[PDB]
Amino acid sequence: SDGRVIYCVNIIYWYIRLLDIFGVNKYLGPYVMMIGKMMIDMMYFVIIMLVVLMSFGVARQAILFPNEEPSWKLAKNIFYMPYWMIYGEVFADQIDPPCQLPPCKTGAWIVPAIMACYLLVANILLVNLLIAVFNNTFFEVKSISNQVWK
Amino acid sequence: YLMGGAYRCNYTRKRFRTLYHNLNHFPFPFHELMVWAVLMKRQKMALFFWQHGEEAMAKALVACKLCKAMAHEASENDMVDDISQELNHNSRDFGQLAVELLDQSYKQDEQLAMKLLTYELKNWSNATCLQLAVAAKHRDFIAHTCSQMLLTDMWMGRLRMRKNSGLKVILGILLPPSILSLEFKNGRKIYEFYNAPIVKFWFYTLAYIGYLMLFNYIVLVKMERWPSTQEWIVISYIFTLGIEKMREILMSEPGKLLQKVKVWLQEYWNVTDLIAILLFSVGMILRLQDQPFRSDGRVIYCVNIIYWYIRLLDIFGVNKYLGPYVMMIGKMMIDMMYFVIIMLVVLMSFGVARQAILFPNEEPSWKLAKNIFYMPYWMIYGEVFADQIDPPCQLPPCKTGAWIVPAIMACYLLVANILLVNLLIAVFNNTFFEVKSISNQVWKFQRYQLIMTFHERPVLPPPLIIFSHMTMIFQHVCRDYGLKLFITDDELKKVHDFEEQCIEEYFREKDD
Ligand SMILES: CCCCCCCC(=O)OC[C@H](COP(=O)(O)O[C@@H]1[C@H](O)[C@H](O)[C@@H](OP(=O)(O)O)[C@H](OP(=O)(O)O)[C@H]1O)OC(=O)CCCCCCC
Ligand SMILES: COCC(CCO[C@H]1CC[C@@]2(C)C(=CC[C@H]3[C@@H]4C[C@@H]5O[C@]6(CC[C@@H](C)CO6)[C@@H](C)[C@@H]5[C@@]4(C)CC[C@@H]32)C1)COC
């Protein structure tokens, strides 16, 4: 089973290596080089989003669940839900549940406000600024990629 | 009064007062003549006097600062407003002269250009050209290549590792035996290693990372009746940071207690740090109580961990590519907040309409103010539903006019997700070049303040800075480099000859 999992991980690289074959086409090589440079730009703009996501996740996890023993599942809830939240999977019962009715945690009304601010920052500010960065640095990258491919 | 707080003119010194009370000549007459021409607002005379005599760059920077101060004073006292424009033009002319002279000097000889920017000026209240340019807020001077190289040399300290820095500093600060395998510039090696600004910065950065780690640990796990070891370490970090802030307030430039506070509450980071420290103090006080106040203190701790996570961008602002991006974020925040008002108007209209249409038998309760903002705000972030909004009304009775909600939602989604956000994308796109250039210039200007404020700090980080605070009291009862550069008379003469050669070459090249 471990060797099969190694095979399943390894098939991804042999799928990605089709771009090397694609680099012979006149129009598909420069695009791949532009992708290669925009990857560096994307990482530089992804560090800040990681910081904001970690802040929001730690705040929500600490507010909602105040009686947790130290376990490695605490390191999973910080990254998982805030990362899936910014890709359109915004929920209203999974985060800030409607607390017959269960007791309401202390300070549980701050989570929707923090989520609102976090969504506004992540989906309206950083991604639009990254779009502007990709847009205003495209001509030089295109020319350099064409020259390098030729 | 026109120059600044720390400036001291030669006229008010005791030697000149004694020489003037019983009434000679001046060693440098063109300095006083140019100051007179600047104060009397005679630009042609000042330009003529600037190119005669020594210390041309210092004279240009001093004239720029004086003209800017006079322009501000004239605009303050409701002058004809043409005098202010003329003074601003004079300041711009002198600043451009200083920049061009610096460019010519750096293009001719680099080492003498760097020596020209750091040597102490006896005639100008003992201040270097860098301090004169910074006090005049001259961003095009500090952003020049020579100034940036000089700042890099000042930031590296007494080290020579330029091929790959950062990693070696970390490896020598985590393995103190690894320090001795480092090249230096012409027992004491450890002292020179631990007093460099970059080593202090990395020490502070590692301490802040550890503090953030402990702060994250103390809030996720269950909080007991009395603080654990990590909580005590976090409280000690906060207390020592507050003491350091008070020390920085007390050791400021002015001699008045209420004026140092006003000049310290200028950067927004200081104000936010003060607010966060007060909030953490309140939360710590409420934590050492019974269960509900303990829960309130824990909530305050969560808000504080939000702030202390956000404060990592200040640390990130040292990287060459991560600072200008943060400043661009700061300006695009203003643009986004300008568009948010229109977004909010549309959202409130849709929310009120839907809430009033669907539920017509509601008593006045504060939950009515929640259903207006909540659901329409989550709707534009991809959580569009069809049963929770406009429910399919065995089957429940249909409310009057319940068919208008899907049409209003369609129009609202079309306006919010296709029009306003695309217009905001266009606004961010078409105003990016100027913001990028301004952010680069501002970051290259603020590098000097970063280097100076890490040069003045103690060696030990805030977790264990309480030792460095105690030793200051012991020295209380009892700058070779980093700020200035003291030279003999022969080197001073050589620098003066180099500067006059540079200005003559500059004028000849301009005429040609
Ligand atoms: C807490 C994280 C904070 C990190 C950010 C806050 C601290 C921070 O800023 O780090 C960056 C720091 C400075 O960069 P560093 O000096 O080592 O090296 C620079 C880098 O090589 C650039 O590519 C060069 O620009 P260019 O293209 O050749 O022209 C630049 O040349 P120059 O022109 O300037 O001479 C080089 O200086 O070192 C790191 O890169 C990785 C450190 C890993 C530390 C992370 C592991 C703890
Ligand atoms: C299931 O049972 C597990 C048990 C062992 C439990 O040990 C615990 C020790 C503390 C530890 C390692 C654990 C979970 C959360 C862990 C946090 C996640 C935080 O993340 C980081 C995330 C990123 C950082 C920037 C911030 O902090 C840590 C400071 C933080 C962190 C790594 C502190 C360490 C915590 C596990 C098994 O043994 C019998």
Ligand SMILES: COCC(CCO[C@H]1CC[C@@]2(C)C(=CC[C@H]3[C@@H]4C[C@@H]5O[C@]6(CC[C@@H](C)CO6)[C@@H](C)[C@@H]5[C@@]4(C)CC[C@@H]32)C1)COC
């Ligand atoms: C749970 O029981 C609560 C009860 C007290 C009930 O008092 C009610 C008095 C009217 C009041 C304050 C209440 C709920 C909706 C409130 C509206 C929300 C609107 O929003 C605003 C939103 C933004 C504005 C631009 C438009 O209007 C208000 C005009 C509107 C507003 C603030 C008017 C005031 C309303 C509460 C407890 O006491 C025993």
Ligand code: NA
């Ligand atoms: Na979506």
